Design a protein around this ligand. Sequence first.
Ligand code: KV3
Length: 335
Amino acid sequence: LSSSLKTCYKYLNQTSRSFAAVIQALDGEMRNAVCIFYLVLRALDTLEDDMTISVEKKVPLLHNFHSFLYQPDWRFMESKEKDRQVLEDFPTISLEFRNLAEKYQTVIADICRRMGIGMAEFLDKHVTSEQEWDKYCHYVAGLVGIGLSRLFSASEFEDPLVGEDTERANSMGLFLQKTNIIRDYLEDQQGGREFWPQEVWSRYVKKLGDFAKPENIDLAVQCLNELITNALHHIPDVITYLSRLRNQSVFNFCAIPQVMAIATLAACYNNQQVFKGAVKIRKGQAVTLMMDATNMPAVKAIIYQYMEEIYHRIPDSDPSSSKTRQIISTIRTQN
Ligand SMILES: COc1ccccc1[C@H]1OCCN([C@@H]2CCC[C@H](C(=O)O)C2)C(=O)CC(=O)N(CC(C)(C)C)c2ccc(Cl)cc21
């Protein structure tokens, strides 16, 4: 490994922690292409996230980020976020980008161009409709699923359908992103961020911060249940997506995040604790999920088990109850 690629893997371990191993297990040219894409997206996210960067400066940064990949000297020295090293040392990451085969460079660049446009559009707004929530999630997450899929197909480790079916790929990203958004309600509130869709929360309370107050806990949990029900709608696509993967290392890479998201949603379902802190699955639970999630029968078994758990906890008076039961039933009877 060049020193510059070695530095990239150091940043990958610093940024992705124990998921770094799963990336490092990817076969052949996939390994480096995903590592670099991971880092480049981390840089883009860090720009988007940084509230100390003004809108007039942020918009050009997001629009032009795809171009910076091709500018050997481009870096950004003014960030105040946790992962700011990937921006300060962007030249090292962009050098390794430019060492990828062109078929992987062009995927990453195109994705960054489109994600930038979409991120720039949401600087000025909160998410209103569920349709807008899917549009926002496409920009920040769904496009990541689509990019990764295109790397898998372009490397020829997976059939071209994996890269072409943008909707199944998009669903992979939306499932993770909506799960994060749901779970991070309170941490977001405290950082002054709002991602729950206004059209949903506005039917329970007047302001989204209201869900943190004790008198509204019943309403908060109803909204939580409704948004979780929304996220579950992506699981048929997730199953379809995973069922097409033929490469073991790619399977594990895609499957492990999804089962951990499923278990997280199950933990969060009808759970007051979402409104008081960060509900997380136990480390030993996570490890077992990661070790188990390596073939379709086992992933389906995990999904069905957590969905049955949710099913049996649905309160009769929950306003989303028959929608929750309906999507769980669809998932169960598909595979
Ligand atoms: C659409 O996303 C995928 C599709 C197929 C395969 C992998 C991913 C995903 O990585 C897995 C999620 N993840 C870990 C996995 C282990 C448990 C960890 C935990 O905190 O519990 C979280 C990540 O660190 C990265 C991440 O969150 N995203 C998803 C986003 C885009 C919704 C923010 C991500 C970013 C870039 C790249 Cl190159 C991949 C990924």
